[PDB]
Structure formats: C-alpha cells, structure tokens
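Re: your question from the hallway

Yes, I did run it. Sequences:
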Amino acid sequence: SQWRSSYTRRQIRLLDSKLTSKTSLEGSIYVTDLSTMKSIPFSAFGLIPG
Amino acid sequence: SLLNNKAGVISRLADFLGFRPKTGDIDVMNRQSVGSVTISQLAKGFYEPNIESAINDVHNFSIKDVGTIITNKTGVSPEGVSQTDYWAFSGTVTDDSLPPGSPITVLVFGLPVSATTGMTAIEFVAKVRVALQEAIASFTAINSYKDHPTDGSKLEVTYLDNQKHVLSTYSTYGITISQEIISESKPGYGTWNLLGAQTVTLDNQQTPTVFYHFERTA
Amino acid sequence: SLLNNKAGVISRLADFLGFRPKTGDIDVMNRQSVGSVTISQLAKGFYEPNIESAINDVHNFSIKDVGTIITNKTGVSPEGVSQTDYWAFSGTVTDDSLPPGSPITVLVFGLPVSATTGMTAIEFVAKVRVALQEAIASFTAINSYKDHPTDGSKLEVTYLDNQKHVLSTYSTYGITISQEIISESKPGYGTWNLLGAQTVTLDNQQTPTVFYHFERTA
Amino acid sequence: SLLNNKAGVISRLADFLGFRPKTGDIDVMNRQSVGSVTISQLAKGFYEPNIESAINDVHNFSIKDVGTIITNKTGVSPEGVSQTDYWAFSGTVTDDSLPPGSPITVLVFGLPVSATTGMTAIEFVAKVRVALQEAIASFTAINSYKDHPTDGSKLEVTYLDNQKHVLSTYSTYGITISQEIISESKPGYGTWNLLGAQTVTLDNQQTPTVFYHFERTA
Amino acid sequence: DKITSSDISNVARKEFLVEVQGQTDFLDVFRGTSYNVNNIRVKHRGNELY
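Structure:
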C-alpha cells in the first residue's frame, strides 16, 4: 500500500521569453512565450511519484 | 463591509470598472452624466456607469473642433509639448547568477535591454539603444531617444505624450539607471496655428491690448 | 510582487480605486492634485487619492461656464454630437435547446431582446424594437433607434452620449447582429450659440479675418 | 467568462489599471491615444494602456497655458469655486460599550473625531473642531471649516477642490452627522484675470456686443 | 483495455527502538485502529517467532 501525499500542493511562476532569459526551474521558475503556448505540461510543477 | 466591497471588480477593463456618475450631469449632449454606461460595454454586458465613458466624455469635452480660434495676449501656440529627458546609466553589467559576458535582459524604465554581464554603462547603453529603438518602434511612451553627446552612459529621451513623466533612479546588475528630466512637457492637444496679432483697445481703456488668435490646424 | 500588488483593490467603486496623484498639481482651485482624496470617499472611508475625483476635476476643468464665448473662424457650434448607427440583423432566430417558437432573450449589443425561435431577422428586429424602447426608456447608451427604411433587419440607432461607439459583429441564435456606424459623434458639451461673425484685420495683416463667437447657452 | 475577467486587476494602482484606449486617438501631441501606456508604468512593469495616463492626458488637454485669454460676454472669471457646506450635528455622544465620558473616535464624513461619551452635539462639535483642524492640517478634501454662528452643533465647511460634494446624513453614537450644502462649487482651474470689456459690433449686426477677456494668471 | 484486477492488502512497518529495558509490550500497535493477528510481524532483527 502507498499512503501517498495527504494534500501537499503546487504553484508555478513563469515570466515570459527573454524577461526571464532563464529556463523553467522545478515548480519555481517556468518560461515560455505566454501568448504562443496556451496551457501547461506539468513537469512544470514539482513532481513526485505519487 | 470590505467583503462585498472587495467583491467589487470582476473584469478589470475600465469599460467594466464602474463609476458613480455625476448627479444631475447633462454635460454630455445636454443628455447624460459623464461616465454613463455606453453601448460599448452594454455589448460587453457591463450595465453600469463606468470609467471608460467618463474619460472619453471629458475628452470629447476638452477637444475643440478643428479651426477653432484660441486667443491670448501671450502668443504660445496651444499645442502640447512632450517631455524630453536624460536616462543616466552607470556601472558595469553584473550578473552573479551567470558567468561574465552572459546575455541578460535589463528593464530600463520598463524597457527591456539585452546586455551581457561585464558591460560597463556605455556598452550597457549600447544595448539600451537597441531597446529604445523598439520603444520607438513599438511607440510605447517614448517618442525618441538620443545618445548623450558627451556621455555614452546617458541618453537623451523623448516621450510620445505631452504628459509629465518622473521616474525613480535604480541600480540593476551593477548598472544604475536614472532619469534626468530635460524639458518639461506643456499642456495642449492637436496642431494649432497663430493667425496673427490683434491689437484691441478695450471699451473704456486707454491702452490697446494685443491678442493672438490660434486656429486649430489639427 | 504581484501578491501585495494583487492585494490591491478591495472595494472596486472608482471612488475607492486609487490614483497616483499628479506630483505638484495645483490645477484644482490652485490647491490640490487631480484625483486627490475627497470628503465623499473619506465619508466612505477611502483615504487615498482616487479615480473618482480625478474624473470630476478635469471634468470641472473642461467645462466652461454658461455664457462663455468660444470663437473660431470655422463656425461650427462647440456643442457635441452623438453617434448614430445602424444595427444590421440577419438570419432566423434559432434555439436548439427549445422547440421552435420558443421565447428567448437575445442581447443585442448588450440589449436583451425577447424573441421566439423561428423568427427571421425581421421578426427578430420586431422584438429588437421592444428592447430599444427600453434602452431609450432606461436611457442606457441609446438616445434613439429608428427602423431601417428599406430593411426590417436593420435599425437606425442613436446613442445618448457624444462619444464614439464601435461594436463587434456577432451572430446569436441564427441571428447576426452587426452595427453599421452612420454618423460620427463630434466633441463638445452643453448647448452653445453662435453670436455672429466678427471680421477682424490682424495687426499688420492686410486681410480681415472673420471670427465666430459661440456663447454657452447650456 | 467572469473567471479570466475576475482574473483582471492584480495591482490596483490606476497606473496598473488598464484602459481600452481610444481607437485612432491622436489627441496626445498628435501622437497616441489617451491613456496609452507610459514610461511611468513601464518602469513599474505595466505594459498596457492605463487609467493613469488617460487622466493626465485630458488633464493636460483641458489646461490652457498661463496667459491664455478666455473671452465671454458674461464676465465670470473662469477660476473654479470650491464647495462650502454645513455639517449639522445633533444628539449626545453615546457609547454603550464604554462608561460615560469614554473617549472614543467618531468619523465625521470620514474625519475621525475624538470625543467622550456623554458629549452633546456641541461638545461633540467642540471635538469635531479638533478633527477639522487636521482635515485642514492634513489638507484632505476640506479647505476650511467654520463654527456655525448661531449653532454650536453645526459647522461651516469648505472643501479644497472645486468639485461637488454631496454626503449622506448619518447618526453615530447618539450624534447625527449631516451635511448642509451652502455654496455650490463652480467649474474652473488656475487663477484667471479679466482684462476688461471689449464692445464688438459683429459683421452685419447693428448691435455692438461686449466681450470679457480672461487672461490666465495661474 | 485494462486488467487492474483483484485487490491489494496493506502492509506497513513501524520499528520500535527498544530502550530502558522493560518494554515487554507495545500498545495500540499502529496508532490508528488495530493489528491484524493472522500474520504476526515482530522482529528483534531476529524476526520473532509465530
């Protein structure tokens, strides 16, 4: 049996394009052109295998 | 009460931001209060008097039709004047989260400037020139920029509007970014023309007074 | 920073929506900045410079007292002009969530129109007439409407204000609702009167110039 | 849609509150729409047309430069007029959550008034005087106050701005607080000066018409 | 498309580091609810007898 998570949570912060100039980090930083890509794939949030 | 107060806004979009209209305000076509709900926001669903209409009303109020004569004794054309400023830059571009010569973006008074770590203010300004082109190319708040003649670390800056623009000196990435106001902006709108001088002796005056008739050319 | 930024607004109600006042702004009674906090919002608890006061100030600025002479060479009365438009309608009223002839409400440029499924644009317009009456009866953004003379599926529309109104063509329930702008609105406020023509020879001009003195009648 | 509508505002700060700009609006320096995004809010990160710029634009539009001649037949100086009011107070200060003579604060039209339970309106007004000093001392919405000559429970009140101020009568702590409007505020800005009278016979009129030339002294 | 089939019983572990000597009993087993008798589990790291 897995007891999994019991809540936890995620939150993402992206800034667009060069304004970051930096790539996504964990669930901390994300980056993209915001108008270019709708949605999110999430590995973008912190992922743990539950 | 902050609850239903905070309830408030929803949609932002000053179309949709409400306005308590002026009580007994006919100034619109001798009809309705300034900021009264308009068919624009009705189409958008917003049924309340709003900030949008209030701006265009007084806007439509303060705009005299082309060809209107403005008359003064002074003789300054009513036409507005944009503000012109310096942006003083100093230091060397510094990012300790990246190696030297690391391309980064720097927001200069809100203008992104792509620059690599290690650039002094001058090389930083060299990049700032690139951004100011876009600020002109995008025509955002900046009418024009010019390199400071005796300083590479300053830039002569001109704003699109006739409003007054005062900004705060800050230092990012070892680059101090400060605005040095050169020319004050002057109130006015459109393009105006002095017709010429009219000397007028008032009714019981002894002294003839001169007037300057400013037609609106735009 | 968006946190305490988003913290922001609370109560909406542009009374309560803040405004960074103009720095060194005496234009109000030679006293205070435009948009400075007023006893209205103090009574309402809001202690900050606000959007409300900023509108009335420039409003109170752009409104010349009754009887003021506006002078131009052109001769158009300063009085504003409302925009007049067509609303072009097409198709048959269609609701597939209800049987044919199903009374529904249709928002025409934000105006609800009660209509039953199966109505063509004309019968739809027949109902649109009912709503436009209310839009006039409620006096919301619509000064008047008139049936398109040669088309039942269009309606001549007049707006209360002197502002400009541009709306987006959409098709609901098999009814396309589009706005066809007829007359442009013109800037102005109140009721004005041309006094007459004054021919004036400027100081060293050879040519007498004519002026048109517009008194404010309201 | 209210979701992404409600998404909206974030930062409040009408700098950061957006504005749908006027379509095809050159009235700023013959350049950009009113409310267009400015280097102020760019520096602040806000990239959209905003409420801030829209206020200063029409503000900068409705402000005629010093020395400009306003001409009318009537002769009222363009200078604005502040509103002057009475604040009528009644009853005895009452706090049932505290013993009699309990110092409390009372918000009079948003002005805090420190008063102790048991004070009649007069003693309440005696304290109200203290607050009005601050309202003058802080220069918030209140130009001046004066004691009602024949009534201690009323106070003659003057507001900083030239706007119109209408407030709601309320009764707190056994003290009714009501505003009695004395003088209407009049539109205008700055300090103006009548040059004198010009009698003018219009082109084909028989009757000479008099004008009053109002120079801007501030 | 999928055989997820049957059921998964539940094993959890709680180690008791022995102190103080004494300690001839342990109460509540796993804090919530009960132990399931049929399969006895206890170890000295020698795994204790049935």
